[PDB]
Ligand binder design. Sequence first.
Ligand SMILES: N[C@H](Cc1ccccc1)C(=O)N1CCC[C@H]1C(=O)NCc1ccc(Br)o1
Ligand code: NA
Ligand code: NA
Lengths: 11, 250, 28
Amino acid sequence: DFEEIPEEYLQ
Amino acid sequence: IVEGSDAEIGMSPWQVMLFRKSPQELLCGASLISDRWVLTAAHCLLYPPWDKNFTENDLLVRIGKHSRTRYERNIEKISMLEKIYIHPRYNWRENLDRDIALMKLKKPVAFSDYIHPVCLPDRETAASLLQAGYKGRVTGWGNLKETGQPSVLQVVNLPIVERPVCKDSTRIRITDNMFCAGYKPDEGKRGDACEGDSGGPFVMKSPFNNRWYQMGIVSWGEGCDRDGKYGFYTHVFRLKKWIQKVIDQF
Amino acid sequence: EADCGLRPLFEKKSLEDKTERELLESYI
Ligand SMILES: N[C@H](Cc1ccccc1)C(=O)N1CCC[C@H]1C(=O)NCc1ccc(Br)o1
Ligand code: NA
Ligand code: NA
């Protein structure tokens, strides 16, 4: 439902 | 938010979205109070009846947002959490007394046209504005109805309600650390917070100095926008000594 | 902060939002 956020914030 | 409207761009630049890392989803609202500190409801982070007990690494905050679901490139900023602080006397067992928490960000956020902190009330501003009939503003990305979800941030203005009316509307025990807001059935207008608006701010614009103050935090309600029911808000000023202690110590 | 509660796109530019007057009118 949500647009994927940049991977940098999930590292 | 039930029976609200779309926010204007930059209308609530202190509004924060609490976001779960995996699965990626909205958890709660929150508010920016300085370049490194975010204020929310304790029940957004800790609520054992629902098996909720988040740690810092579970969560992110998204600041400067308007769209609920889009990644707002070049506008929003996404921050990791250094530490969560929940009020030590937060009562999750009974009635959500002292439903307040602070989150310290790993790095300070840069302010912009879309990102700016709200003020916290002093005693005099609280005494002057926390009066029955005076209206505040509630914002969030939560559900549009009790029983669906908005494209952009929603806003509703709601009057503070007399304490005896708040008490007589519910069987839950009310405390001095809460206030309630909403229209009465005979008033015609309506509106309420709902699921997903938890932790977001109830703000008022001081007519003395023309600044916005956060007087409340979306805390609890029985249903959403029901006649004769009201939404309950954490009384920020009553808990400000704890806020100051945390920020000074950490 | 020194400028807390003053919105860049509203108070800082002396522009009002579409419903803030409803709040002011309630502060009776
Ligand atoms: N219905 C129960 C009642 C209840 C109240 C106190 C203690 C236990 C239950 C509820 O409100 N909640 C359950 C835990 C979280 C909270 C909640 O959904 N808040 C969100 C929301 C809706 C409107 C507004 Br304002 O805030
Ligand atoms: Na009662
Ligand atoms: Na109601």
